[PDB]
């Protein structure tokens, strides 16, 4: 019963994106590419109002595959040579419905010496019958 019941739902949005550059000279580990993945808010709105911490599960080949970002812009800047499906989990700060999301995002790259990669994605979060304080956070972002 979509909007058939008297329920007040708030809807937020998160952005999964990444830019992938190659280097004309690979790094010390001989990695050719440097990519920066990020999770952002709706239209560049700061999401730290409902977003607590975020995590990027990189490939085990990467030093510290688990990148949690509690600081400013949720982004990981790492170097590699090959792309892969990178599961991103976004943590929220609340005591209600599950405060973690799981977005499967493909980290793709170009050949060394080819057009870079700039892919943005926007995912909606929908919360049925949330607490007003939580709405206040979802609105303030």
């Amino acid at each position: 019963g979509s909007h058939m019941a008297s329920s007040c739902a708030v809807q937020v949005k998160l952005e999964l994106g990444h830019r992938a550059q190659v280097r004309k000279k690979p790094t010390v580990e001989g990695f050719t590419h440097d990519w920066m993945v990020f999770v952002r808010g709706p239209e560049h709105s700061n999401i730290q109002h409902f977003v607590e911490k975020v995590v990027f599960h990189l490939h085990e080949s990467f030093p510290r595959p688990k990148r949690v970002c509690k600081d400013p812009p949720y982004k990981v800047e790492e170097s590699g040579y090959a792309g892969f499906i990178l599961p991103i989990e976004v943590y929220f700060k609340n005591k209600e419905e599950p405060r973690k999301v799981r977005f499967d995002y493909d980290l793709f790259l170009h050949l060394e010496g080819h057009p870079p990669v700039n892919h943005l994605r926007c995912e909606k979060l929908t919360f049925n019958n949330p607490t007003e304080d939580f709405r206040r956070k979802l609105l303030k972002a």
């Binding site: 590419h33 490939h59 040579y81 090959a82 792309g83 892969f84 499906i85 170009h110 050949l111």
Partner: peptide, 13 residues
């Protein structure tokens, strides 16, 4: 397809 190399998380799973 036709892009940079790929190291999948699970080989043919």
């Amino acid at each position: 397809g036709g892009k940079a190399p790929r190291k999948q998380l699970a080989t043919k799973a």
